[PDB]
Design an enzyme around this catalytic site. Structure first.
Site, PDB file in Angstrom:
ATOM      1  CB  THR A 224      41.311  35.649  42.235  1.00 11.59           C
ATOM      2  OG1 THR A 224      42.526  36.190  41.963  1.00 11.59           O
ATOM      3  CG2 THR A 224      41.003  35.449  43.374  1.00 11.59           C
TER       4      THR A 224
ATOM      5  CD  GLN B  12      47.910  37.807  37.564  1.00 11.37           C
ATOM      6  OE1 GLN B  12      47.348  37.272  38.306  1.00 11.37           O
ATOM      7  NE2 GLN B  12      47.827  38.631  36.393  1.00 11.37           N
TER       8      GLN B  12
ATOM      9  CE1 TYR C  34      43.876  43.326  41.463  1.00 14.40           C
ATOM     10  CE2 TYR C  34      43.702  43.366  43.853  1.00 14.40           C
ATOM     11  CZ  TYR C  34      43.485  43.042  42.776  1.00 14.40           C
ATOM     12  OH  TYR C  34      41.959  42.672  42.501  1.00 14.40           O
TER      13      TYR C  34
HETATM   14  C1  FMN Z   1      36.391  35.608  39.232  1.00 16.03           C
HETATM   15  C2  FMN Z   1      37.468  36.514  38.198  1.00 16.03           C
HETATM   16  C3  FMN Z   1      38.865  36.326  38.998  1.00 16.03           C
HETATM   17  C4  FMN Z   1      39.888  36.856  38.430  1.00 16.03           C
HETATM   18  N1  FMN Z   1      41.124  37.048  38.888  1.00 16.03           N
HETATM   19  C5  FMN Z   1      42.070  37.730  38.220  1.00 16.03           C
HETATM   20  C6  FMN Z   1      43.378  37.775  38.882  1.00 16.03           C
HETATM   21  O1  FMN Z   1      43.540  37.014  39.873  1.00 16.03           O
HETATM   22  N2  FMN Z   1      44.400  38.380  37.987  1.00 16.03           N
HETATM   23  C7  FMN Z   1      44.190  38.928  36.783  1.00 16.03           C
HETATM   24  O2  FMN Z   1      45.128  39.496  36.004  1.00 16.03           O
HETATM   25  N3  FMN Z   1      42.910  39.169  36.291  1.00 16.03           N
HETATM   26  C8  FMN Z   1      41.906  38.162  36.729  1.00 16.03           C
HETATM   27  N4  FMN Z   1      40.660  38.165  36.559  1.00 16.03           N
HETATM   28  C9  FMN Z   1      40.386  38.781  35.130  1.00 16.03           C
HETATM   29  C10 FMN Z   1      40.304  37.700  34.009  1.00 16.03           C
HETATM   30  O3  FMN Z   1      41.761  37.308  34.082  1.00 16.03           O
HETATM   31  C11 FMN Z   1      39.863  38.104  32.476  1.00 16.03           C
HETATM   32  O4  FMN Z   1      41.053  39.312  32.082  1.00 16.03           O
HETATM   33  C12 FMN Z   1      38.785  38.812  32.475  1.00 16.03           C
HETATM   34  O5  FMN Z   1      37.816  37.799  33.100  1.00 16.03           O
HETATM   35  C13 FMN Z   1      38.163  38.935  31.227  1.00 16.03           C
HETATM   36  O6  FMN Z   1      38.321  37.739  30.535  1.00 16.03           O
HETATM   37  P1  FMN Z   1      36.837  37.066  30.126  1.00 16.03           P
HETATM   38  O7  FMN Z   1      36.028  37.968  29.201  1.00 16.03           O
HETATM   39  O8  FMN Z   1      37.429  35.865  29.107  1.00 16.03           O
HETATM   40  O9  FMN Z   1      36.267  36.294  31.244  1.00 16.03           O
HETATM   41  C14 FMN Z   1      39.741  37.668  37.035  1.00 16.03           C
HETATM   42  C15 FMN Z   1      38.112  37.697  36.515  1.00 16.03           C
HETATM   43  C16 FMN Z   1      37.324  37.023  37.223  1.00 16.03           C
HETATM   44  C17 FMN Z   1      35.792  36.984  36.697  1.00 16.03           C
END
Ligand code: FMN
Ligand code: FMN
Lengths: 386, 386
Positions: A28, A103, A185
């Protein structure tokens, strides 16, 4: 250098063929218009990440309907204009040679109650409970207090999921549609004992708490086909009042039953495109139950997550690896991981900078500098695509 | 040499102080009389296994009542003579410095229908299903066909569990009583989707299939106290028609719920003495859920399991290790494992040799020969301890 591994080995997901197994998870960013319309900034944003990739991108969590929201400048796949804009984003992503899944988001008791009120919408949840006293005070001062969903509102939720899935797959052309059922959610709220005190068939047991999710999944599968459907789960998460391991019923049992039901549907010839899971506690048991494509996300690119990326992606032939935070600051992340080139640090302070290209389109490719906050793109106002 | 590991570190289990963590799991041998009274051979057997041990011995699966059986020359704790014999055995085990638990057996649809018939008892199960066409065949010719339990037969089952538990703990002086809920016997039959087709409170859901086990557990807790009670579960076993991972509902969800409920009773001040477990199959999730003493058994002595023995027993400070088949051969197995002494191989052909000391008491301690089948001890007819 990760070109040696399964991370850059092609894989069949759904009915499409991904060139690699690196995934941009839903992230997001709030770069839509106040009308919840996708912008040219978002189009370039996904375009750069579909270039030289061949893999799968997953959109920011997108509201299926106005009642599914709301956050200011969030995404939506509801009106004609929104579907046009998302359709153009999809067409550009596919022109780039990549693939994209959307999503679907539903906030529940996590939503902005003031914004919902200003759009004439109630503040809904499985039970009339807030995840924090802060949210309770916010909803009480907005005059939009949380309400336990009626049967009619649940039916309407299902129909809205079907309509949004049809708009995404058939009108906009997305390759998959991913049901967001994680992170406290709405659907997670129905799953969690902390949030669900219902005494009808949508609460009071493991089968009942998982019922709404499974019914949405079945209707969406009937609408667009199982190979165009996915889901995300976060059994250990405690975000927004979710119980995690502290739930009165352990998440291994609850989400274990959910995974068992998805695998049963797969055994009856309706196999989801993928199941998305968040790395913490250990997710091994999940992989015991679900036999299909599994997308694992979280921590993999940290100074220690590497060599669990290698281990997990090479452990079998059905594992995708999602990297979100570094994908925000590295538009050419697939090639950097392919060739072993240093990554640009991400900037959390600009994750949610509303409607601004600063920290959104200011990132350069490898060897190129970060554009400053006063640059041309950083100060250009995003424009809707339709 | 295993003396350095946690296998020989003291540990508190319930109210008891175990000097080591090696356990003799319940091992059916059928050396009781034809009226199910413990025998002098059994006293010498458990006695030899209590010398130089200080560990925990677990008694052969014992019928809580006539309806809980029946097998030829099986054990029972029902009549006064039976309770007195078992009391003599317990007194000898405590005298030799070790500790003992009694496992309580209920056959259900796994029983001998001919024997039950000869004792004027029906052949009961959660649903009218046989685990094999051979069992169906033996039941139909004895004129004792399988019956789905009535509500009053369930109530009588729970009362019988209470009575047997009180007999073993308070009269015979057992340190704890273990509820056998594994390997496709009655309680496992209630747990398994393959055997439980009930539409009433005791079937048709995860909570409903686990209901009888948890009710029995709660009643026995109320009877003798939580630190005098244990349970055994085999989520992966497919013995006697149990579904294993092929069940309609995955065993991680079902037994995950069971373990979550037992840990919940632990959170409320009723912590079981231990949970006994049997073994991409992996029991790590079980340890994620249950936080108390866990007894892991199966295959730990194969020179492919020695490493898994050291690993699983050193992974934490609440793990007991059960060794059954080699304990039948090595009455001094604690010393042998403690000093790396070679083990006497086990003879499966005399595991179930009815009413015979041959292959039962003919085993010698380390440095001694196996007594031949024509020895004095091997030719003796066992006598009741009554
Ligand atoms: C700014 C931000 C927005 C995110 N938005 C979503 C989202 O909208 N839906 C979702 O399922 N996960 C969302 N996530 C979680 C990520 O999809 C991911 O699972 C999480 O950042 C861990 O992965 P990473 O270590 O590679 O960053 C978001 C994470 C961040 C940092
Ligand atoms: C002859 C024999 C009898 C057994 N009887 C029982 C029993 O009555 N109840 C039970 O729960 N397990 C019983 N078991 C299973 C053992 O308790 C144990 O779980 C299994 O033998 C694996 O342990 P091991 O590899 O050390 O032999 C029996 C096993 C054998 C070989």
């Amino acid at each position: 250098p990760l070109a040696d591994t399964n991370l850059f080995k092609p894989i069949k997901v759904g009915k499409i063929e991904l060139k690699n197994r690196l995934v941009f998870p839903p992230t997001t960013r709030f770069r839509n218009t106040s009308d919840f319309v996708a912008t040219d900034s978002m189009l370039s944003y996904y375009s750069q990440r579909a270039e030289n990739n061949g893999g799968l991108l997953i959109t920011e969590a997108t509201f299926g309907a106005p009642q599914f929201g709301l956050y200011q400048n969030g995404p939506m796949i509801y009106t004609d204009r929104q579907v046009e804009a998302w359709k153009k984003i999809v067409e550009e992503v596919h022109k780039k040679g990549s693939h994209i899944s959307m999503q679907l988001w539903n906030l529940g008791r996590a939503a902005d109650p003031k914004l919902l009120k200003e759009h004439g919408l109630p503040f809904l949840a499985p039970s009339a409970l807030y995840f924090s006293e802060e949210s309770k005070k916010a909803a009480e001062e907005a005059g939009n207090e949380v309400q336990a969903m009626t049967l009619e509102q649940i039916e309407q939720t299902k129909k809205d999921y079907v309509n949004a899935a049809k708009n995404a797959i058939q009108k906009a052309g997305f390759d998959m549609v991913e049901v967001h059922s994680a992170h406290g959610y709405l659907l997670d709220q129905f799953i969690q004992t902390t949030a669900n005190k219902r005494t009808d068939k949508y609460g009071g047991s493991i089968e009942n708490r998982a019922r709404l999710l499974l019914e949405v999944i079945d209707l969406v599968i009937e609408a667009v086909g199982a190979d165009h459907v996915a889901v995300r789960l976060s059994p250990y998460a405690t975000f927004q009042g979710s119980g995690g391991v502290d739930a009165e019923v352990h998440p291994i049992a609850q989400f274990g039953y959910i995974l068992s039901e998805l695998e049963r549907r797969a055994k009856e010839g309706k196999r989801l495109a993928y199941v998305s899971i968040v790395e913490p506690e250990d997710n091994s048991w999940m992989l015991q139950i679900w036999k299909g494509v599994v997308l694992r996300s979280g921590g993999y690119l940290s100074e220690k997550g590497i060599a669990h990326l290698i281990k997990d992606v090479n452990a079998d032939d059905r594992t995708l690896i999602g990297c979100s935070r570094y994908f925000t600051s590295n538009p050419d992340l697939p090639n950097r991981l392919r060739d072993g080139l240093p990554l640009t640090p991400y900037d959390r302070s600009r994750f949610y900078k509303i409607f601004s290209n600063d920290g959104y389109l200011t990132w350069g490719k490898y060897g190129e500098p970060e554009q400053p906050s006063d640059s041309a793109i950083a100060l250009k106002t995003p424009q809707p695509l339709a």
